[PDB]
Amino acid sequence: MDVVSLDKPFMYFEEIDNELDYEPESANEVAKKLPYQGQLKLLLGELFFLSKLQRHGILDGATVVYIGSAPGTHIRYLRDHFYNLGVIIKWMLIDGRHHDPILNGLRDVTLVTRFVDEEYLRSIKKQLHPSKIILISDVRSPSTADLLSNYALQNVMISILNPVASSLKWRCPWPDQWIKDFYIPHGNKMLQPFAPSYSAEMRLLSIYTGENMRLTRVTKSDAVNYEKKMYYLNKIVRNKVVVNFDYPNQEYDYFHMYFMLRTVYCNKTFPTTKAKVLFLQQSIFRFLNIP
Ligand SMILES: Nc1ncnc2c1ncn2[C@@H]1O[C@H](CSCC[C@H](N)C(=O)O)[C@@H](O)[C@H]1O
């Protein structure tokens, strides 16, 4: 058994203290172990991000614009969580595909079946006005050409929607498939527990202060680094059993998840953080129908 004692997990890409030469063979390895892992990955991360906003005093009263939301089965639990805490939020979910019916009939969530373009973003910006916006984008077209095009759109989202915070889907293209150096918004590289076994994807979380917009170039040397750190994490780290982690599940991912969950806010008071986390995990697993 691959055991170990860890103090804390790698919460952000910058914390990963080791790299590995990427082994193409890993592509053939089982990508997921849990049912609805996708909605799990999505929800913990989106819960983490939003709790922050709440912590910063910027969530309440905001309109959450989620682009690339369908099915968005998990979004429903998210919506209830803040709604039950008493935070006022309006959700505007947009996708060309259809949303999980559990999203319907809630007055505070508006579904839209529209593939957004730069033009559309301008009208939704005029119609949202003057509400403060929090943007969440998880749009997907894949080729580096596809990727760049997506990253380009996310950038036009922020420039037109002019949000107070954002969470963007972030996966660097692969160095052996580089096309050109491009810019992404400055934000924290949030590591996603329960992401596919060899996923190099994370979530870019940014808070927009002032009227400024800080970007950052991404070059192939960067793409090489992203590849090596993400492969070491996936291969080595994530397959770690945190034997000093006293929990129903000591596997890394749950250890990593405990850490994002211990930051989430609840109504019920617990004697310990073990209790709140066991509680929110159980709650979310039950919601997702995950054993
Ligand atoms: N311009 C566009 N506008 C909106 N959604 C888009 C888009 N281009 C791709 N997408 C959508 O992005 C989605 C990628 S999957 C997104 C999953 C969703 N966040 C969840 O909770 O399950 C797809 O449904 C796709 O239709």
Instruction: Tally the residues of the chain.
Output: 291
- Say how far apart CA 154 and CA 118 lie, in whole Å: 10
- Say how far apart CA 24 and CA 21 lie, in whole Å: 10
Strands 63-67 and 90-95: parallel
Contacts of 109 (CB under 8 A, 6+ apart): 75, 79, 90, 91, 92, 93, 103
75 lines ligand 1 (CB under 6 A): yes
103 lines ligand 1 (CB under 6 A): no
Strands 241-242 and 188-190: unpaired
Ligand 1 centroid–CA 68 distance in Å is 3
- Say how far apart CA 157 and CA 163 lie, in whole Å: 9
Taking the CA atoms of 264, 60, 288 and 200 in sequence, report the sign of the dihedral they define. negative
Give the rounded distance of the alpha carbon of 104 from its chain centre: 23
Ligand 1 centroid–CA 236 distance in Å is 31
- Say how far apart CA 120 and CA 133 lie, in whole Å: 16
74 lines ligand 1 (CB under 6 A): yes
What was the structure determination method? X-ray
∠ CA(199), CA(40), CA(274), 5° rounding? 110
Ligand 1 centroid–CA 157 distance in Å is 14
180 lines ligand 1 (CB under 6 A): no
Cβ neighbours of 9 (radius 10 Å): 22
DSSP type of residue 28:
G
- Which residues are 241's β-sheet partners? 3, 251
Edge to edge, what strands does the sheet with 165-170 contain? 109-113, 90-95, 63-67, 133-137, 165-170, 202-207, 188-190
Joined together, the tokens standing for residue 202 give: 């994370």
Angle between helices 73-85 and 37-56 (to 10 degrees): 30
- Say how far apart CA 79 and CA 71 lie, in whole Å: 14
Contacts of 137 (CB under 8 A, 6+ apart): 66, 67, 68, 153, 154, 157, 166, 167, 168, 169
Q: Which of 127, 135, 175 is nearest to 53 (CA)?
A: 135
User: Contact 154/168 with Cβ under 8 angstroms?
Assistant: yes
- DSSP of 217-257: EE-HHHHHHHHHHHHHIIIIITT-EETT--SS--BHHHHHH
Structure's resolution in angstroms: 2.6
Distances (CA, A) of 131 to 87, 155, 254: 15, 20, 36
The full set of domains in the chain, from first to last, is 1-291 (3.40.50.150)
Probe target for ligand 1 pocket from 74, 120, 139, 153, with the most ligand atoms within 8 Å of CB: 139
- Say how far apart CA 236 and CA 4 lie, in whole Å: 11
- DSSP of 109-128: EEEEE----HHHHHHHHHHH
- Say how far apart CA 189 and CA 182 lie, in whole Å: 16
- Which residues are 217's β-sheet partners? 183
- DSSP of 123-179: HHHHHHTTS-EEEEE------HHHHHHHHHHHHHHHHHH--SEEEEEE----GGG--
Q: Breaks in the chain at C–N > 2.5 Å: after which residues?
A: 141
Element (H, E) at 261: helix 252-261
